[PDB]
């Protein structure tokens, strides 16, 4: 574990993270995809061997000794708000299990289902709160990666609020 486990946020490409492992915002079929998933495919292509996994689950594949945790959030175009919310909460619990099993002291994580799986809605608060619910009982340093300046401010505010 980290000596004083923390949350931080950075506005940059998760493929350039400074953490001991990465969470991919994966699709269920282990395809290169777009956004975070395409950047992860270009940086750690070996991690996409047998990475396919259902919605609401996480499956880790090593690229050398560097763990890539493929987490499949729901596509809110396809799910009801209720079922999508349940699967988004489940994906993050599976991420906490994997981070714990790996024994890492740090993890780089994107906000699941906030991009092309958002169903055109702002899900910053919904996705971040499910991230906190899952990761608060872990002792890894968590670094959240985002791309938008307004999102960075709102994530930073939510972290600082809890102290
Ligand atoms: N996570 C992000 O960087 C982000 C930015 N703008 C909309 C949705 N997600
Ligand atoms: Cl960058
Ligand atoms: Cl997404």
From Swiss-Prot:
Subunit structure comment from the entry: Interacts with mRNA-capping enzyme nsP1. Interacts (via C-terminus) with host G3BP1; this interaction inhibits the formation of host stress granules on viral mRNAs and the nsp3-G3BP1 complexes bind viral RNAs and probably orchestrate the assembly of viral replication complexes. Interacts (via C-terminus) with host G3BP2; this interaction inhibits the formation of host stress granules on viral mRNAs and the nsp3-G3BP2 complexes bind viral RNAs and probably orchestrate the assembly of viral replication complexes. Interacts (via C-terminus) with host NAP1L1.
Bilayer topology: Peripheral membrane protein
Disulfide topology: none
Residue ranges occupied by any Macro domain in the UniProt entry: 4-163
Mutagenesis or variant effect for residue 36 to A: Partial loss of mono-ADP-ribosylhydrolase activity
Protein name per UniProt: Non-structural protein 3
Function: Seems to be essential for minus-strand RNAs and subgenomic 26S mRNAs synthesis. Displays mono-ADP-ribosylhydrolase activity. ADP-ribosylation is a post-translational modification that controls various processes of the host cell and the virus probably needs to revert it for optimal viral replication. Binds proteins of G3BP family and sequesters them into the viral RNA replication complexes thereby inhibiting the formation of host stress granules on viral mRNAs.
Outcome of swapping residue 27 to A: Partial loss of mono-ADP-ribosylhydrolase activity; complete loss of ADP-ribose 1'' phosphate phosphatase activity
Portion of the full sequence shown: 1334 to 1493 of 2474
Intracellular or extracellular location(s): Host cytoplasmic vesicle membrane
Entry comment, domain topic: In the N-terminus, the macro domain displays a mono-ADP-ribosylhydrolase activity. The central part called, the alphavirus unique domain (AUD) has a zinc-binding function. The C-terminus region, also called hypervariable domain (HVD), is mainly disordered and binds several host proteins. This intrinsically disordered domain contains 2 SH3 domain-binding sites and 2 FGDF motifs necessary and sufficient for the formation of nsP3/G3BP complexes.
Post-translational modifications: Phosphorylated by host on serines and threonines.
Residues the record lists as binding ADP-D-ribose: 13, 27, 35, 115-117
Effect of residue 117 to V/W: Almost complete loss of mono-ADP-ribosylhydrolase activity
């Amino acid at each position: 574990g980290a000596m004083a486990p923390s949350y931080r946020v950075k506005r940059m490409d998760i493929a350039k993270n400074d953490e001991e492992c990465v969470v991919n915002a994966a699709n269920p079929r282990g395809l290169p995809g777009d956004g975070v998933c395409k950047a992860v495919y270009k940086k750690w292509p070996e991690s996409f061997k047998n990475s396919a996994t259902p919605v609401g689950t996480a499956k880790t594949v090593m690229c050398g000794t560097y763990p890539v945790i493929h987490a499949v959030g729901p596509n809110f175009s396809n799910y009801t708000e209720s079922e999508g919310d349940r699967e988004l909460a489940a994906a993050y619990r599976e991420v906490a299990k994997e981070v714990t099993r790996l024994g890492v002291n740090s993890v780089a994580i994107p906000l699941l289902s906030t991009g092309v799986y958002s169903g055109g809605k702002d899900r910053l608060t919904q996705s971040l709160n499910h991230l906190f619910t899952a990761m608060d009982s872990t002792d890894a340093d968590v670094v959240i990666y985002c791309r938008d300046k307004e999102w960075e401010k709102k994530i930073s505010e939510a972290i600082q609020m809890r102290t």
